[PDB]
């Protein structure tokens, strides 16, 4: 089946390994200039974005930072061994190592540069790794920008690997499997103290898809049903179908020349149907998928087998219409005609089931008691080992309900059937005789069903939510008759390998579900906190559903995806993702201000202001802050499109500050500054009412300017009316950028813990149930 292929093809979790230190900045050599704008012979190292690609517009910048958040989440490793990143530091005195290769490149460039101070060369010579083999630790020198150091330190200190040993591997097995005496577990390895593993994220369903998401829950329950079918064991050593049919024929005393109801009793009795019924029942109970009863009212054996089925399976597992039909057939064909009661006129839509009315109306203690049990036979919701489970009544588990049912049937057989022909009573008696000749086998079958159900339930990791599904699984009552008639005495219990495979598939699905929930929640929360008001979030939920791998998103409307978005929006963010986003939020202003492609704004003042002296520009019309100016938000202006205020301010020469990520033209011409060109770049705003084209002028006046002789020869400090709201780069201090990154010296990470456990089963004849008795006791 394709569904089983999709569900079993999920891999546990893709483990991420860091091969290089995450970096947003790098050192870069820049020419520096004196206070008068003259170039110095020495250069200077500054921090510059490695990938300077920030876009225009504040909204676009926030989108860029959301994309950066996604990148950082992608690059965040599950574990890290710094020795893999370590490379030789050629200039180290002790021939030590540094991390990563980019650090080594920076060290080489600094050391070889003739302008480097000898103290920095001494510092580079001291840079080497320290190994503490006793503690299994290693510290490597690294050159990192403070934001880069923060990110890498978080990665180093928040790894997902935990120590692994034999006790942990053994405890990975469900507690009920270990506590089961029918399984013997073994190991042939002693995991070393340096072994590691990653725990699956088995948080319970935070989206509560069992509540109000009926199509998605139908898909989930169908996948669970298919998996449960795949793992349910096959019945072995069934009674031969031919011999059983012969025995049934002899008991029924079939006549050639007479039309009889008993003939139909032999309909659809085969081993295929028996196995199909066993699998259907156990899989439906495990996956909590609603079942539908398929039967023909003319087959009374189907009705007696249905009596057994209703005795054992809680009636909430069947769609109401089919259950009501089966119960009405049982009442009007077996129960009421036996006791001479008038045929029940049951109304469709009655609040009470036919069995409840019959229980009220039947004066026979055994039949009424069985009816009452069937009416009140429910599952029990119990949280076992942290997982919600649906537990069968203990009388079902031990098989005593079969004895109660048999008492009811024996009371029915003794009745006179006052108002029916004697042949009708004969047919009912013959059907009851067929069922009752296998009383011990029915007790054995009930115990086997219950034991298989609970053993396979021990391997379920997600809560077993009992809610009626949109679609049902059809169960034929002829298959129930086949199971009742052909079940032998051979006990079949889930293989330990089958149990481990089932548990591993469940764990893989649960972990994938939780990880995709975490991803979607992180992305949604980040988009909300970044004020991405134009962002339609359907794509995020669509990706989430695609990565769950069991839904067909083409069948999921947009409203359902937005309801999923609303549910995801209320969940807290995972700790690691939340902290990474906190780092990004803290440092995004500084990351943006480090870009050479955009400026943080433009101050249009209509007074001469002396160009600022900076070493890496010379004279530059840079504003460090927007103090003493009215601010116009260019993002709000573009969103609303109303240019009345900005036009009024530009036409009236009212000093203002246009704030927003803007591209700027770097100009080094002194003659252009004298010509006051920077003040001529705003009339287009009035003309076209568009600020996307705005591109202020950033003057860079220094000795590299062709007309710097004007500055030199007139003791003239350049002045400009317009300033560019922009920051200056931070100097690269080699000593201050050195950090000792600490990690574990070495460990080995393991994926499949149950691969280290070999499990076998006791002899099936000796397999016991919860009550210490053998599951099947018939000879």
């Amino acid at each position: 089946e394709s569904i089983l292929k999709k569900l079993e093809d999920i891999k546990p979790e893709q483990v991420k390994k860091q091969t290089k230190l995450f970096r947003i900045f790098e050192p870069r050599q820049l020419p520096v200039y004196r206070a008068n704008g003259e170039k110095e012979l020495r250069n200077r190292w500054y921090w510059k974005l490695k990938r300077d690609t920030l876009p225009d517009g504040d909204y676009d910048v926030r989108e860029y930072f959301l994309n950066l958040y996604d990148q950082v989440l992608t690059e965040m490793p599950d574990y890290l061994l710094l020795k893999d990143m370590a490379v030789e530091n050629k200039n180290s005195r002790d021939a030590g190592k540094v991390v990563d290769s980019e650090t080594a490149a920076i060290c080489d460039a600094i050391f070889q540069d003739e302008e480097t101070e000898g103290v920095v060369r001494r510092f580079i010579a001291e840079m080497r790794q320290r190994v503490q083999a006793d503690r299994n630790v290693v510290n490597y020198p690294s050159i990192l920008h403070p934001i880069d150091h923060a990110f890498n330190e978080y990665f180093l200190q928040h790894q997902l690997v935990e120590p692994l040993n034999n006790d942990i591997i053994f405890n990975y097995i469900p507690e009920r499997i270990r506590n089961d005496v029918n399984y013997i577990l073994n190991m042939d390895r002693n995991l070393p103290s340096t072994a590691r593993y990653i725990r699956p994220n088995l948080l319970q369903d935070r989206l509560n898809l069992h509540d109000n998401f009926e199509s998605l829950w139908d898909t989930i329950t169908t996948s669970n049903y298919i998996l449960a079918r795949s793992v349910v064991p096959d019945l072995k050593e069934l009674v031969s179908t031919e011999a059983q049919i012969q025995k049934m024929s002899q008991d029924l005393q079939l006549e050639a020349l007479t039309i009889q109801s008993e003939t139909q009793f032999l309909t659809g009795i085969n081993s295929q149907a028996a196995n199909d019924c066993f699998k259907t029942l156990i899989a439906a109970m495990l996956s909590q998928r609603t079942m539908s009863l398929d039967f023909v009212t003319t087959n009374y054996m189907s009705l007696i087998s249905g009596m057994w089925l209703l005795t054992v399976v809680p009636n909430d597992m069947f769609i109401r219409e089919s259950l009501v039909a089966c119960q009405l057939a049982i009442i009007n064909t077996i129960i009421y005609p036996a006791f001479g009661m008038q045929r029940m006129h049951y109304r469709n839509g009655d609040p009470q089931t036919p069995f409840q009315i019959a229980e009220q109306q039947i004066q026979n203690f055994q039949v009424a008691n069985w009816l009452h049990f069937v009416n009140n036979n429910q599952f029990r919701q119990v949280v076992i080992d942290g997982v919600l489970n649906q537990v069968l009544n203990d009388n079902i588990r031990n098989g005593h309900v079969v004895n109660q049912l048999m008492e009811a049937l024996m009371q029915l057989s003794r009745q006179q059937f006052p108002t029916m022909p004697v042949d009708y009573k004969r047919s009912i008696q013959r059907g009851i005789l067929l069922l009752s000749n296998r009383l011990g086998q029915l007790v054995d079958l009930t115990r086997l069903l219950a034991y298989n159900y609970e053993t396979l339930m021990a391997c379920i990791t997600m809560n077993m939510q009992h809610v009626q599904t949109l679609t049902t699984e059809k169960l034929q009552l002829t298959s129930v008759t086949s199971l009742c008639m052909l079940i032998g005495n051979a006990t079949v219990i889930p293989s330990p390998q089958t149990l481990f495979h089932y548990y591993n598939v469940n764990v893989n699905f649960h972990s994938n579900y939780n990880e995709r929930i975490n991803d979607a929640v992180a992305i949604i929360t980040a988009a909300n906190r970044l004020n991405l008001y134009q962002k339609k979030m359907k794509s995020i939920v669509e990706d989430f559903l695609k990565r769950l791998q069991i839904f067909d998103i083409s069948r999921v409307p947009d409203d359902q995806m937005y309801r999923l978005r609303d549910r995801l929006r209320l969940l807290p963010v995972e700790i690691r993702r939340l902290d990474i986003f906190n780092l990004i939020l803290m440092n995004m202003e500084q990351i943006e201000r480090a870009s050479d492609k955009i400026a943080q704004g433009v101050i249009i003042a209509y007074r001469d202001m002396q160009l600022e002296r900076d070493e890496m520009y010379g004279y530059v019309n840079i504003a460090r802050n927007l103090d003493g100016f009215q601010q116009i938000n260019l993002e709000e202006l573009m969103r609303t499109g109303d240019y009345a205020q900005i036009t009024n301010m530009l036409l009236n020469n009212q000093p203002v500050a246009l704030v927003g990520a803007l591209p700027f033209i770097t100009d080094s011409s002194v003659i252009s500054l004298v010509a006051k060109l920077d003040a001529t770049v705003f009339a287009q705003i009035v003309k076209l009412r568009k600020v996307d084209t705005l591109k202020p002028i950033l003057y860079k006046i220094n000795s590299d300017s062709n007309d710097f002789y004007l500055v030199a020869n007139y003791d003239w400090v350049p002045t400009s009316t317009t300033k560019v709201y922009k920051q200056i780069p931070q100097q690269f201090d080699f000593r201050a950028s050195m950090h000792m990154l600490t990690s574990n010296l070495t460990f080995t990470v393991y994926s499949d813990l149950l691969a280290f456990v070999s499990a076998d089963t006791v002899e099936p004849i000796n397999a016991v149930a919860f009550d210490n008795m053998r599951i099947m006791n018939e000879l």
């Binding site: 229980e359 009220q360 203690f365 009424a368 008691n369 009452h372 049990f373 009140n376 036979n377 429910q378 009544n393 009388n395």
Partner: protein, 133 residues
């Protein structure tokens, strides 16, 4: 007060109606109310204080629900219900005593014992039923 009275009324009804041989139809609603009380009280820790010579008593509730399978109640059902009802009756009597021995000048109509003050929380409103006294 209404929740405490509801507990006491439920326990009195359980004592009077859960008898050997009685039809389950005679106790179906009573069994449902008793099980609701069990669910609501389960997992809650109570203390009746030591004012005067009243012993300090701690109460834990981890009781399973009453059965719903017997057409007519039998001796085993009655004995299990008796054990649960005895514990609950002890708890209710101790709470009532702890409340009776306390008084306040400012708000005398409000509960004075910490047990009855805890029972005045919203989560216990489910226990509330017929107030006929």
């Amino acid at each position: 007060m209404d929740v405490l009275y509801s507990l006491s009324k439920t326990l009195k009804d359980a004592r009077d109606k859960i008898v050997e041989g009685t039809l389950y139809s005679n106790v179906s609603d009573l069994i449902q109310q008793f099980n609701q009380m069990i669910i609501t009280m389960n997992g809650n820790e109570f203390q009746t204080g030591g004012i005067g010579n009243l012993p300090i008593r701690n109460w834990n509730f981890d009781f399973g629900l009453l059965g719903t399978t017997l057409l007519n109640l039998d001796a085993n059902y009655v004995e299990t219900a008796r054990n649960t009802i005895d514990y609950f009756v002890d708890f209710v009597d101790n709470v009532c005593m702890d409340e009776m021995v306390r008084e306040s000048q400012r708000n005398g109509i409000a509960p004075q014992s910490d047990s009855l003050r805890k029972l005045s929380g919203i989560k216990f409103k489910r226990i509330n039923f017929d107030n006929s006294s």
